Amino acid sequence: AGRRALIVLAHSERTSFNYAMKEAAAAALKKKGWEVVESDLYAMNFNPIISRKDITGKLKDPANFQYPAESVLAYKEGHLSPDIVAEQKKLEAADLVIFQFPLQWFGVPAILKGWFERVFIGEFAYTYAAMYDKGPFRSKKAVLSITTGGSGSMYSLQGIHGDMNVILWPIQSGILHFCGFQVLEPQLTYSIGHTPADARIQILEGWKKRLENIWDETPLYFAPSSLFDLNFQAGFLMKKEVQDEEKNKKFGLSVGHHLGKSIPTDNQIKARK
Amino acid sequence: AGRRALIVLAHSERTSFNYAMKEAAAAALKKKGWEVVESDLYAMNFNPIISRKDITGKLKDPANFQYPAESVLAYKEGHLSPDIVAEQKKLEAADLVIFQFPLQWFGVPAILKGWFERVFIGEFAYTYAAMYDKGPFRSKKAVLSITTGGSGSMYSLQGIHGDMNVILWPIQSGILHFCGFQVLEPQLTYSIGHTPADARIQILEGWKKRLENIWDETPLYFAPSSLFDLNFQAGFLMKKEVQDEEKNKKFGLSVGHHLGKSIPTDNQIKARK
Numbered sequence: 001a002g003r004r005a006l007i008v009l010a011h012s013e014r015t016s017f018n019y020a021m022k023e024a025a026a027a028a029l030k031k032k033g034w035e036v037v038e039s040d041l042y043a044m045n046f047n048p049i050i051s052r053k054d055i056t057g058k059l060k061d062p063a064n065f066q067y068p069a070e071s072v073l074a075y076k077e078g079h080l081s082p083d084i085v086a087e088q089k090k091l092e093a094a095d096l097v098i099f100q101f102p103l104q105w106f107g108v109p110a111i112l113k114g115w116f117e118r119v120f121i122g123e124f125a126y127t128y129a130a131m132y133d134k135g136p137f138r139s140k141k142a143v144l145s146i147t148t149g150g151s152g153s154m155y156s157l158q159g160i161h162g163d164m165n166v167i168l169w170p171i172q173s174g175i176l177h178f179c180g181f182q183v184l185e186p187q188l189t190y191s192i193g194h195t196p197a198d199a200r201i202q203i204l205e206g207w208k209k210r211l212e213n214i215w216d217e218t219p220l221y222f223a224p225s226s227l228f229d230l231n232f233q234a235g236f237l238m239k240k241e242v243q244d245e246e247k248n249k250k251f252g253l254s255v256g257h258h259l260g261k262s263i264p265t266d267n268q269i270k271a272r273k
Numbered sequence: 274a275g276r277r278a279l280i281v282l283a284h285s286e287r288t289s290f291n292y293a294m295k296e297a298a299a300a301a302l303k304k305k306g307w308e309v310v311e312s313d314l315y316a317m318n319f320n321p322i323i324s325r326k327d328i329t330g331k332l333k334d335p336a337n338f339q340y341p342a343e344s345v346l347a348y349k350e351g352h353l354s355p356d357i358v359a360e361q362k363k364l365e366a367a368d369l370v371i372f373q374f375p376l377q378w379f380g381v382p383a384i385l386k387g388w389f390e391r392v393f394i395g396e397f398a399y400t401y402a403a404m405y406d407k408g409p410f411r412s413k414k415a416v417l418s419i420t421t422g423g424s425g426s427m428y429s430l431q432g433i434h435g436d437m438n439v440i441l442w443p444i445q446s447g448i449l450h451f452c453g454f455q456v457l458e459p460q461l462t463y464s465i466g467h468t469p470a471d472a473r474i475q476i477l478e479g480w481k482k483r484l485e486n487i488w489d490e491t492p493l494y495f496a497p498s499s500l501f502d503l504n505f506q507a508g509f510l511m512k513k514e515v516q517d518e519e520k521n522k523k524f525g526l527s528v529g530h531h532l533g534k535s536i537p538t539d540n541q542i543k544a545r546k
């Protein structure tokens with residue numbers, strides 16, 4: 001089960017609803033016996049920009065700096081910037097990771113985007129040989145608790161912004177699941193700036209109620225990596241048998257693997273698929 | 274037509290292909306009579322974090338800081354941080370804006386994400402009353418020129434990463450088109466790290482060739498805001514009449530407006546739709 005939790009918050013104001021939601025999760029989990037650690041990016045004045053400075057020492061090839069290779073090497077040899085390592089330790093010690101943030105330009109705040117870029121270093125957070133379900137964080141679970149200015153209807157299939165499931169895909173599949181994370185249902189609190197005070201109090205309590213049993217939840221469905229030929233040769237394309245079999249399925253496997261057919265309803269919002 | 278172009282680069286190395294793509298684009302554009310301005314985020318050591326320091330004036334509500342409102346107010350009264358103002362001036366002058374960046378965790382680099390967050394302030398880059406096609410930059414055109422580590426097949430409908438069209442959606446529709454921009458087909462350069470020297474040279478020539486007539490291209494398709502009842506009362510939902518003409522249609526309208534049906538092939542990569 002789950003015993004330790006990491007709450008990554010990306011909001012500058014201690015007076016925001018996001019901070020309240022972070023406080024609610026901390027209280028709720030602790031009161032349930034969990035150990036809670038925080039990564040309040042702004043309060044920590046976190047540096048989100050990847051650079052050659054992330055490697056405390058000489059680079060393998062300063063004449064042509066390539067961050068991927070250099071950062072992985074620094075990782076292996078233990079030359080990663082201290083601030084990066086400290087976060088990597090929080091990740092390794094955590095069973096549950098909660099990402100609390102306000103949706104910004106249909107994605108995560110830049111400070112958090114940068115946190116992934118500098119913290120999710122190769123070898124540590126992933127390998128091309130163990131992508132997705134086989135990733136390093138397979139024993140861990142992640143959840144996005146998001147707040148927005150736009151109303152839920154704006155994000156429905158007929159809303160002007162379009163399906164929220166598409167917006168979540170690059171984050172939940174491309175970032176979290178790629179590293180092995182079992183991704184749980186996102187906590188979506190729409191139009192928080194247009195919500196009555198009593199309703200907000202209920203949102204907080206609802207979030208705490210869910211956290212009581214968060215670890216017994218069934219995670220989102222992503223196509224298993226066993227359906228693909230995971231080698232540079234086949235170009236990591238679906239196995240031909242799976243393709244043929246899939247040809248007789250009404251729905252695609254997920255948002256990203258829609259295969260040109262109907263995307264399973266709320267594939268990135270609701271579990272059981 | 275268009276004589277003014279802005280190239281926003283998000284890469285720290287002068288030795289990268291990304292920098293090469295930036296030079297090639299500028300060289301080719303100037304050759305066709307364009308005026309070319311640049312925003313090399315790293316070279317500028319651009320601040321990517323939105324904070325109350327983006328406002329130089331006295332806040333309207335200092336004890337309860339709210340970025341959306343305060344920033345919009347600062348734009349309206351001329352109290353925005355001068356570095357943000359400098360970027361906004363480049364945007365207003367530009368006819369064509371090119372975003373050159375390496376794909377990082379299925380999105381734009383944090384430094385570029387922060388650029389959108391601090392520079393695309395309300396009123397300046399958008400207004401709820403005139404979202405999408407009615408936005409401020411509707412007389413402008415934007416293009417994403419991306420380079421990736423992974424091969425094209427990994428991003429095909431059956432590649433492990435999933436459809437690249439889904440990854441592109443939140444940036445091209447949510448950020449670019451939301452502000453009125455006509456978005457042109459993205460220049461996609463896959464597995465740049467695994468491309469032979471002679472091929473890389475051809476990729477650059479091909480990019481210069483495309484830019485020779487970039488302004489006359491058909492842009493990508495996004496559902497017009499006219500298909501929606503644009504008011505907090507109708508939940509910014511698609512017009513009932515429009516919803517009825519589609520129930521018979523096979524394909525959805527776009528990636529975000531797939532409507533539970535099939536997404537039009539390469540909706541976010543190829544024009545004509």
Ligand SMILES: Cc1cc2nc3c(=O)[nH]c(=O)nc-3n(C[C@H](O)[C@H](O)[C@H](O)COP(=O)(O)OP(=O)(O)OC[C@H]3O[C@@H](n4cnc5c(N)ncnc54)[C@H](O)[C@@H]3O)c2cc1C
Pocket residue numbers: 011015016017018019020101102103104105106107147148149150151192193197200201323338339340341389390391
């Ligand atoms: C750069 C940028 C980009 C954005 N892009 C998007 C986008 O793409 N899509 C979109 O939909 N939105 C977008 N937004 C809007 C953003 O998502 C919302 O402004 C944000 O989620 C609002 O929540 P908040 O917690 O940050 O803060 P706040 O606006 O402060 O709101 C929290 C509310 O709850 C109250 N409150 C605070 N603490 C408590 C407590 N303990 N108990 C009860 N009530 C409390 C506050 O007084 C306030 O009214 C963007 C905003 C910015 C700045």
Ligand SMILES: Cc1cc2nc3c(=O)[nH]c(=O)nc-3n(C[C@H](O)[C@H](O)[C@H](O)COP(=O)(O)OP(=O)(O)OC[C@H]3O[C@@H](n4cnc5c(N)ncnc54)[C@H](O)[C@@H]3O)c2cc1C
Pocket residue numbers: 050064066067068117118284288289290291292293374375376377378379380420421422423424465466470473474477
């Ligand atoms: C934090 C992070 C996250 C990432 N996330 C992803 C992801 O989600 N998906 C993904 O697919 N990839 C990802 N990548 C990989 C990234 O997309 C590639 O490393 C990048 O696109 C490579 O291009 P480059 O221009 O930066 O540099 P380089 O790797 O240097 O490659 C350019 C190549 O062209 C050569 N070259 C330079 N100038 C010229 C010239 N003028 N003419 C001809 N050849 C030239 C160089 O020597 C080099 O071999 C990530 C990388 C990082 C650091």
Ligand SMILES: C[C@@H]1CN1C1=CC(=O)c2c(c(CO)c(-c3ccccc3)n2C)C1=O
Pocket residue numbers: 104105106148149150151154191193194341342401447451
């Ligand atoms: C996608 C681009 C980035 N932006 C936004 C889009 C919205 O649709 C929106 C916002 C806000 C916040 O400014 C509210 C909002 C805020 C308060 C109360 C009600 C709605 N709404 C509906 C945005 O910021």
Ligand SMILES: C[C@@H]1CN1C1=CC(=O)c2c(c(CO)c(-c3ccccc3)n2C)C1=O
Pocket residue numbers: 068126128174178378379422423424427464466467
């Ligand atoms: C980990 C984040 C999610 N993304 C990546 C996914 C890939 O599939 C990938 C990367 C790289 C770059 O590290 C190369 C690559 C690099 C050099 C040569 C060949 C492939 N490939 C195939 C990534 O960075």
